[PDB]
Design an enzyme around this catalytic site. Structure first.
Site, mmCIF file in Angstrom:
data_model
loop_
_atom_site.group_PDB
_atom_site.id
_atom_site.type_symbol
_atom_site.label_atom_id
_atom_site.label_comp_id
_atom_site.label_asym_id
_atom_site.label_seq_id
_atom_site.Cartn_x
_atom_site.Cartn_y
_atom_site.Cartn_z
ATOM 1 N N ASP A 56 111.345 17.692 -120.131
ATOM 2 C CA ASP A 56 112.419 18.467 -119.522
ATOM 3 C C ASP A 56 112.420 19.883 -120.055
ATOM 4 O O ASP A 56 112.510 20.110 -121.260
ATOM 5 C CB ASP A 56 113.782 17.827 -119.780
ATOM 6 C CG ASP A 56 114.911 18.631 -119.177
ATOM 7 O OD1 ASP A 56 115.411 19.548 -119.855
ATOM 8 O OD2 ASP A 56 115.293 18.361 -118.022
ATOM 9 N N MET A 57 112.363 20.852 -119.166
ATOM 10 C CA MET A 57 112.293 22.227 -119.626
ATOM 11 C C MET A 57 113.576 22.681 -120.319
ATOM 12 O O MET A 57 114.589 22.264 -119.946
ATOM 13 C CB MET A 57 112.010 23.152 -118.447
ATOM 14 C CG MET A 57 110.816 22.745 -117.613
ATOM 15 S SD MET A 57 109.233 22.568 -118.549
ATOM 16 C CE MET A 57 108.882 24.231 -119.069
ATOM 17 N N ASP B 156 113.224 20.639 -113.006
ATOM 18 C CA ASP B 156 112.649 20.999 -114.313
ATOM 19 C C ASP B 156 112.261 19.802 -115.177
ATOM 20 O O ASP B 156 112.092 19.937 -116.399
ATOM 21 C CB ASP B 156 113.612 21.908 -115.097
ATOM 22 C CG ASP B 156 114.613 21.139 -115.944
ATOM 23 O OD1 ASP B 156 115.102 20.067 -115.520
ATOM 24 O OD2 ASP B 156 114.869 21.603 -117.079
ATOM 25 N N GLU B 157 112.088 18.634 -114.563
ATOM 26 C CA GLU B 157 111.666 17.512 -115.370
ATOM 27 C C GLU B 157 110.856 16.487 -114.610
ATOM 28 O O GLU B 157 110.978 16.335 -113.387
ATOM 29 C CB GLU B 157 112.871 16.850 -116.014
ATOM 30 C CG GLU B 157 113.673 15.966 -115.108
ATOM 31 C CD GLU B 157 115.112 15.858 -115.579
ATOM 32 O OE1 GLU B 157 115.461 14.863 -116.255
ATOM 33 O OE2 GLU B 157 115.889 16.784 -115.295
HETATM 34 CA CA CA Z 1 116.242 21.225 -118.749
HETATM 35 MG MG MG Z 2 116.584 18.577 -116.355
#
Ligand code: CA
Ligand code: MG
Ligand code: MG
Length: 430
Positions: free
Chosen positions: A16-17, A118-119
Site C-alpha cells: 500500500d502506497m 494505491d494497493e
Molecule cells: Ca495508502
Molecule cells: Mg490504500
DNA sequence: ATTATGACGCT
DNA sequence: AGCGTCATA
C-alpha cells in the site's frame, strides 16, 4: 489435531502506497517534499476538501475528510496541492497513471490483484518456493530484511524504535528452522525478503515509498501492512494471531468496519476479534448468515481463503459529480450540459483504455441522486454502450433518467439533481 | 457541503 | 437488474 487446517498454505502480501496522492504531487513539485502537505479537491467551499495528507501534516492532526480551512487552523504552514479540474470537475488521471506505474512494477514479481488506486495483493507462494530452492538451506540474514517488523516481537526475558525492530527481527530469525522447506514461518520470512525487493524496486523506479504486510491471507496481510506505516513492512505469522487478536477491535478487520461488525459487537456482546473463538460455527452462522458465519469462525483463528485474483486493471470506468446545496441542477439544460461533461471525460478514458488494454465496454450505467434522499444513489439504470461517443452517451443517459423529473414543466428539473454518475461496465476483449 | 471513485453481495 | 454494503485516495 492432525486434521485441523491452520490456513498456512499461502504467502500473501499487501502493498500500500504511503500518502499516495501527496507523494505523486511531491515527486512533481520538489518544494512540497518533506513538508506538512495535503492534496485538496476544489477550493471555494471551506478551502476545498482534503483527500490525502503527508505524515508531517498528520502530526498536527490534519486528516483526510477535513476541509482545508479547518486543517489550516491546526497547521497554519500546511502546503496544499490541488486536484486537477477538467470540464468543470475533479479529474484523477494523474493518480490513476501513477498507480499504473506501481502496479506494472509489482507485476514483475508476481500475479497481483488491484485492490484500490494505491494497493495490490500479491500471492507469493510460488515465488517463495523458488527462492527457497536457490537458497539451499542457507540462513536468512537480517540484512535481507532492513525495513521489516515481526509482529509480537521482541518478547520475554534499548528504548529506540529501530533498535526494537532489530531486537524483534533477531528473535524471529534466531528461532527459524531454515532446514524445512515446508515451514510456514520460513515461507513467510522468504516472502518478506521478496517484498523488500519489490518495495525497493518501486522506490527506485518511481520515487514512491510504500508499506506492506506479509501473512498467510489477504485479511492478515492488509492488517499487517497498517501496523508499521510509513515506509516499513510487517510480517504477521500464524502464531502471532492469538495475542494480536486478543485486543484487536472487531472493526479493524476488513469488511467488519460497518454495520455487520457493529452487529457482531452488539449481538454477541464482545469487543475484540479474539473473543469470537468462543462461538461455534453454527452459532455464528445463526446470527450472521451461512457465509459470514463460516468466514468469521475461520477468520478469528487467522484463517481466510479468499484468493488473490489475477486482475491488475479496474473492471469499471466511472465518472461522478456531486451538485450540493445550492448548486443542485434544476434545469434541463443544466442536466444535459453536465451529462455531456461527464460523458466527455468517460469517452476520453474509455478510448485510452481500449488502446492500452485491448477491451471494450458494452454497458453504460447511469445513476443520479435527488435532493432529500439520505442514500448515496437514488436511482441506477443501465443501457447499451455501443459506441465510444460522448454526445451519444450523454443523450442516452438523459433518456434513461428523463422521467425522474417530477416537474410538470419539462424545462425545469424537480426535485433538483444533487449527483450525476456515468459508468462503463461489462468489458469484452477487443 | 468530503468527493470521486470501485468491488462484491443480495434477491 | 437494481439496490446495498464496504472500502480506497
Ligand atoms: Ca495508502
Ligand atoms: Mg490504500
Ligand atoms: Mg488511506
Amino acid at each position: 489435531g492432525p486434521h485441523m487446517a491452520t490456513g498456512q498454505d499461502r504467502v500473501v502480501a499487501l502493498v500500500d502506497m504511503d500518502c499516495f496522492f501527496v507523494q505523486v504531487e511531491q515527486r512533481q513539485n520538489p518544494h512540497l517534499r518533506n513538508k506538512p502537505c495535503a492534496v485538496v479537491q476544489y477550493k471555494s467551499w471551506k478551502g476545498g476538501g482534503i483527500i490525502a495528507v503527508s505524515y508531517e501534516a498528520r502530526a498536527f492532526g490534519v486528516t483526510a475528510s477535513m476541509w482545508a480551512d479547518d486543517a489550516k487552523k491546526l497547521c497554519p504552514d500546511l502546503l496544499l496541492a490541488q486536484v486537477r479540474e477538467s470540464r468543470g470537475k475533479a479529474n484523477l488521471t494523474k493518480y490513476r497513471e501513477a498507480s499504473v506505474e506501481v502496479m506494472e512494477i509489482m507485476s514483475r514479481f508476481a500475479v497481483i490483484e488491484r485492490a484500490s488506486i494505491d494497493e495490490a495483493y500479491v500471492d507469493l507462494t510460488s515465488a517463495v518456493q523458488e527462492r527457497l530452492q536457490k537458497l539451499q538451506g542457507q540462513p536468512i540474514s537480517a540484512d535481507l530484511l532492513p525495513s521489516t517488523y515481526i509482529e509480537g516481537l521482541p518478547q520475554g526475558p534499548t528504548v529506540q524504535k529501530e533498535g526494537m525492530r532489530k531486537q524483534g527481527l533477531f528473535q524471529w530469525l534466531d528461532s527459524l528452522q531454515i532446514d524445512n522447506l515446508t515451514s510456514p514461518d520460513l515461507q513467510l520470512t522468504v516472502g518478506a525478503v521478496i517484498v523488500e525487493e519489490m518495495r525497493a524496486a518501486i522506490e527506485r523506479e518511481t520515487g514512491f515509498q510504500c508499506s506492506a504486510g506479509i501473512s498467510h491471507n489477504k485479511v492478515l496481510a492488509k492488517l499487517a501492512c497498517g501496523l508499521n506505516k510509513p515506509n516499513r513492512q510487517t510480517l504477521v505469522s500464524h502464531g502471532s494471531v492469538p495475542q494480536l487478536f486478543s485486543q484487536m477491535p472487531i472493526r479493524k478487520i476488513r469488511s467488519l468496519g460497518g454495520k455487520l461488525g457493529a452487529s457482531v459487537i452488539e449481538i454477541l456482546g464482545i469487543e475484540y476479534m479474539g473473543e469470537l473463538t468462543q462461538f461455534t460455527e453454527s452459532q455464528l452462522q445463526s446470527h450472521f448468515g451461512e457465509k459470514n458465519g463460516s468466514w468469521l469462525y475461520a477468520m478469528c483463528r487467522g484463517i481466510e481463503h479468499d484468493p488473490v485474483k489475477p486482475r491488475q486493471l479496474p473492471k469499471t470506468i466511472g465518472c461522478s459529480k456531486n451538485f450540493p446545496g445550492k448548486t443542485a441542477l434544476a434545469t434541463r439544460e443544466q442536466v444535459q450540459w453536465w451529462l455531456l461533461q461527464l460523458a466527455q471525460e468517460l469517452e476520453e478514458r474509455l478510448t485510452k483504455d481500449r488502446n492500452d488494454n485491448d477491451r471494450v465496454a458494452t454497458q453504460l450505467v447511469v445513476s443520479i441522486r435527488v435532493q432529500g434522499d439520505k442514500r448515496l444513489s437514488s436511482l441506477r439504470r443501465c443501457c447499451a454502450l455501443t459506441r465510444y461517443d460522448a454526445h451519444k452517451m450523454s443523450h442516452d443517459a438523459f433518456t434513461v433518467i428523463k422521467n425522474c423529473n417530477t416537474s410538470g414543466i419539462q424545462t425545469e428539473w424537480s426535485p433538483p439533481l444533487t449527483m450525476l454518475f456515468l459508468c462503463a461496465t461489462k468489458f469484452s476483449a477487443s
